[PDB]
Amino acid sequence: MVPISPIETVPVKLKPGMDGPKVKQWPLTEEKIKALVEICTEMEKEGKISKIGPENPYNTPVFAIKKKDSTKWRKLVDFRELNKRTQDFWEVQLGIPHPAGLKKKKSVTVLDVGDAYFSVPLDEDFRKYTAFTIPSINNETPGIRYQYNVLPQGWKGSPAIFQSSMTKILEPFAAQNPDIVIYQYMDDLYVGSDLEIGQHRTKIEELRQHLLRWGLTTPDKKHQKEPPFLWMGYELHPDKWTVQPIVLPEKDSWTVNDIQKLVGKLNWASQIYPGIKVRQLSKLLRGTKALTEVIPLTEEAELELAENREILKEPVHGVYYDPSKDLIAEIQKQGQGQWTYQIYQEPFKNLKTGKYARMRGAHTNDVKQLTEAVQKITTESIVIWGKTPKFKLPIQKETWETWWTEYWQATWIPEWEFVNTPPLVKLWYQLEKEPIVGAETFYVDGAANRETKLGKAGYVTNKGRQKVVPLTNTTNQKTELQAIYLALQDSGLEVNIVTDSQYALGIIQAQPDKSESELVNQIIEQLIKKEKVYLAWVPAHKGIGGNEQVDKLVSA
């Protein structure tokens, strides 16, 4: 006998105040019991489970399930109740590597470590909670009682404890062989390197020898799995990656479900297929959730879908990451709050692509959305590559400078350069810092009656120009905006406007270029036509003229 090192147990507890499970065993057919008896006798021989005395008060139900197209049974232990009662664990598997962050490899070898899993012993003090009972034939004897000695399949702690145990075992091997990479997934180890094949094979044999120290054996007869790999919805190849085939179905009509699935595929595709769009399709799913409802596609959705089909007509692949090179991220505006990007190191060779959509909200502008996209890409890039890419953005340096220096919030985007690819992001208007000499001054006001919803909006000017318009089904806020709109409409290319609307100032000072409010959009359209606009605020009801006059005209 060659001594093997035991695997250290992870200590496990139930949640505070909770006892173990006490769940009734279901009746089983005579045929199933005989099957289960055989399996457990075999499992017992192998040391996975042990017969226990009558003292243990816990129980978890066991089932026998027929393996389709076979006459063979499998055991299934239903640990749902124990799982609810078991502590939370650190789950190492939460974050999966993005293929775009991987490095090219010459060789990747797969080793089956399926035998090691049932070799991971269970914390001695916890075993009692895993007790289960094989019912007896005709219920004429006590059921056969067992508990687990190893990590049970289906138990809450098994994946985290298995993974952590394998990592600790593999640690010294990885540390002392810095020229390979090792990745565990389920019951397999993946071992990659750039060594000449003879040296790579030697490393695999050395890994096998290392693993034997804990008695974990692997099959001489090599894995059926070899590059390329199907993994987590991707295809991994030695020197490129892609998403698994994306096939958009033909349909005469689309249900809610069809559309959710369609958008899901497009979202998945968008990490390597450049320019994917989902706005108009996603708009169809707004608010409603009877999955069977049939939604007529809008013309816009039909256009988006056709554009996506064209994007998807043939395979596109990404390359892997070369740490010796800079990362570059380029962004384009697509319209309707949509943005698309590519991250590459060499021209025409993307590591990945992606998209960003405008946030929900009342008003917005392209510079703010571009800024948001940059932060999103920055954070994604730190995760995947550990560094911020250099940005190529469709905004002139002078535009950005004017924006950030004058914007009421602090704002920043990291190192970037202008790329002249339309449509360019620009500032559509900029308010004056000081009142304009020689420009007509419009004193504006609006008010509405909260009961009748009638209101008025208008202005008076230093030239004696005046206007009041009667409005129906309106509110104070809308009349305040209407008054500013009237002043913009009726003035020359330069204008001073005096308002008491805190609401309107708060909107305009946010510098929107688009709004959910049609009225705000009309104001923006007017601002775009002006050469100079100075917007002055004064407090209401303070005897402040022009304002006071217009208030009287509009509050009547």
Ligand X SMILES: Cc1cc(/C=C/C#N)cc(C)c1Nc1ccnc(Nc2ccc(C#N)cc2)n1
**Which residues define the annotated binding site for Mg(2+)?**
112, 187-188, 445, 480, 500, 551
In 70-185, the DSSP E strands lie at 73-77, 107-112, 132-134, 144-148, 180-185
264 binds other proteins (CB under 8 A): no
Kindly write down the DSSP assignment for every residue of 84-134, as one continuous string.
HHBPP---TTSSPPPGGGS---SEEEEEE-HHHHTTSB--GGGGGGG-EEE
147 binds other proteins (CB under 8 A): no
Residue closest to 14 by CA, chosen among 113, 87, 73, 72: 87
Select the span of 243-251, 256-264, 373-381, 446-454 touching other proteins (CB under 8 A). Answer: 373-381
Count interface residues toward ligand J94 (CB under 6 A): 8
237 binds ligand X (CB under 6 A): yes
Residue selected from 6, 8, 136, 473 as contacting ligand J94 according to rule CB under 6 A = 8
The rounded distance, in Å, linking the Cα atoms of 231 and 244 is 9
The rounded distance, in Å, linking the Cα atoms of 238 and 517 is 52
Residue selected from 154, 227, 274, 337 as contacting ligand X according to rule CB under 6 A = 227
- Residue 350 is classified by DSSP as E
**Residue with smaller CB distance to other proteins, 156 or 200:** 156
* Residue 408 interacts with, from ligand J94, ligand X, other proteins, none (CB under 5-8 Å by kind): other proteins
Tell me which residues in 164-183 interact with ligand X (CB under 6 A). Answer: 181, 183
Select the span of 85-93, 148-156, 251-259, 298-306 touching other proteins (CB under 8 A). Answer: 85-93
503 binds ligand X (CB under 6 A): no
* 421: three-class secondary structure by DSSP: coil
Residue selected from 228, 274, 275, 337 as contacting ligand X according to rule CB under 6 A = 228
Rg over alpha carbons for the chain, rounded to the nearest Å, is 34
Both ends of the chain: CA-CA distance in Å?
104
Tell me which residues in 259-298 interact with ligand J94 (CB under 6 A). Answer: none
Kindly write down the DSSP assignment for every residue of 461-491, as one continuous string.
ETTS-EEEEEESS--HHHHHHHHHHHHHHHS
For 210, what's the count of Cα atoms within 13 Å in the CB-facing half-sphere? Answer: 20
The rounded distance, in Å, linking the Cα atoms of 242 and 317 is 5
Annotated binding residues, as ranges? 112, 187-188, 445, 480, 500, 551
351 binds ligand X (CB under 6 A): no
Residue closest to 166 by CA, chosen among 106, 197, 211: 211
Residue selected from 168, 222, 349, 542 as contacting ligand J94 according to rule CB under 6 A = 168
Select the span of 166-174, 178-186, 229-237, 263-271 touching ligand J94 (CB under 6 A). Answer: 166-174
> In this structure, which amino acid lies at residue 136?
S
10 binds ligand J94 (CB under 6 A): yes
Select the span of 165-173, 284-292, 293-301, 410-418 touching ligand J94 (CB under 6 A). Answer: 165-173
Select the span of 76-84, 228-236, 253-261, 468-476 touching ligand X (CB under 6 A). Answer: 228-236
Q: How far is CA 95 from the centre of its chain?
A: 12
